From a paper:
[name] is the acceptor of 5Sm. [name] binds [name] by its N-terminal [name]-binding domain (Ge2BD, residues 26–62). By binding the outside of the horseshoe-shaped 5Sm and constraining it in a narrow conformation, [name] helps 5Sm select RNA substrates, allowing preferably the cognate snRNAs, containing the [name] code, to assemble into the inside of 5Sm to form subcores; the assembly of cognate RNAs widens 5Sm, which in turn causes [name]′s release and allows SmD3/B to join to complete the assembly of Sm cores.
We also reconstituted several other 7S complex variations, among which the most significant one is Complex B, a derivative of Complex A without SmG and with [name]ΔN39 (the N-terminal residues 1–39 are truncated to further test the effect of the N-tail) replacing [name]. In the crystal lattice, although [name] is still in contact with [name]′s CTD of a second complex, due to the absence of SmG, [name] at the other end of the crescent Sm hetero-oligomer is far away from the second [name]′s CTD for interaction, eliminating the influence of crystal packing on the curvature of the Sm hetero-oligomer. So, this observation indicates that the narrow conformation of 5Sm bound by [name] is not caused by crystal packing artifact, but is a physiologically relevant one. We term this conformation as the ground state.
Numbering used by the authors:
A (entry chain B): 13 to 77, 88 to 117
B (entry chain 2): 42 to 73, 79 to 124, 135 to 151, 174 to 279
C (entry chain F): 3 to 76
D (entry chain E): 16 to 90
E (entry chain A): 2 to 81
F (entry chain M): 35 to 51
Amino acid sequence: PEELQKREEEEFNTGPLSVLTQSVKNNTQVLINCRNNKKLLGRVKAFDRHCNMVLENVKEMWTEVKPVNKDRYISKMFLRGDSVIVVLRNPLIAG
Amino acid sequence: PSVPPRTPQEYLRRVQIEAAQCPDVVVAQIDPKQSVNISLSGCQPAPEGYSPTLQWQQQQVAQFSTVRQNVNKHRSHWMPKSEDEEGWKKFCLGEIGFPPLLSIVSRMNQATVTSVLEYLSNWFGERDFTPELGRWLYALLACLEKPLLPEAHSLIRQLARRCSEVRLLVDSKDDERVPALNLLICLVSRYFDQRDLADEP
Amino acid sequence: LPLNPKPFLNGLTGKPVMVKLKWGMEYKGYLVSVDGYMNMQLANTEEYIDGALSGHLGEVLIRCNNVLYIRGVE
Amino acid sequence: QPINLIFRYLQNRSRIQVWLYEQVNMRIEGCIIGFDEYMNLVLDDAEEIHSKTKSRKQLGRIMLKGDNITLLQSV
Amino acid sequence: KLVRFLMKLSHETVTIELKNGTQVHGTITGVDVSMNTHLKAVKMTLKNREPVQLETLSIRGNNIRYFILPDSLPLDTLLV
Amino acid sequence: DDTALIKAYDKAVASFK
């Protein structure tokens, strides 16, 4: 039917995409490696099969020429799945 | 049935049918540690009392927008070489050196605006903050057109950090620097969208 | 015994795998999970750039596209 | 079609080489034992052939994604 | 689905990182179902150039890294 | 006004109260 979609949600609460629904359900942060060769640390507000995402409180983090850490902040973001490489559940971050 | 398939399409149809018999999602239970990602800190909060009011920050942001309008009147009407760290420091700060007159900043292109900003931050790291410096930073920021490159976002966050750090050294709100520092922080944090650095009081 | 891509992959769950990505990095870990689109979830994940152990990532979702090949490990 | 090419190679259980899209410094080689409509291959007894350096890394049984594939040929 | 949400965003002005890294500030006239995005009132910022004004730009869904949304944007509302 | 930035700055520093 259309309630065979409720498999989808059973499939997100267990699939590999659980990693995301974690962050949505619990307001947790994740860390995505992105193809722009930078990392995005944020919370996931929403997502689809393709890893299209809406994120909150994102820090874009990267390095550059001896290499210096750089970053930048982004209140709200629509991230295309295409740009995503991998995604850490419970990443470990420090000052 | 219990023959094999002679054409690709048949084989595929045969695969497809097998692939519908399989479970679509499969999870395996395992039974039983992590690198760190070094992240740049935010802005060093303000000592008690020192944090400026929301209505003041909102006030300057609005005022700063206006200021940037005027920066395009003069900009239609048209220096060390762009790469000369040292000269740019001299040129601006001197011993004195030159103020940021529209004459001179409206003639500076974006990549320069940005480089200079770097040079005055590099000065600021190892020298004390003057009001001469305050003027230039304020100017160069007003001469930054947006959307900004990320390199340039990271730049002005660096500078906003450096301000919040210096603000801790102050010992009376009567310090000349305080307002200038609070401003630059407010501008980076509210005009240029890095609200993760902003002084929410 | 023609082995096909879905069943082969479903067959790797539970076990150690080495996923290798389009862009030259590879990741070893225990293949926790797998979906229709061949996304994957690894535990005890280890990153290797140029073959050099780069980091220890723990739990990790890998988007399907980025995968070049996957293979099992002992 | 590229599929018909493969299909056969599966009949012979031929050993094949694969040219990758993103990567030029490298070829994959193996004996093919399954595939699907997106041209993902199960590949047995498989190897990374580095160019220049003439080296070859044993992988064993792998699944190669179909989106990666420039070209297929026999060995 | 998430593309339903993007299509609710006309007249919102945004910034877009393109895949080549170009930053593209503009106002959304339309987003289609494959994420192609038409803009107006556009300002493009390029690594080694000065910027660029343009009355309009239209952009390939698959040429986008991500959208930077306006902070005031009310998400919970649009996520339905 | 050529020094209009310089002015706007000081006005802006000044205005802290």
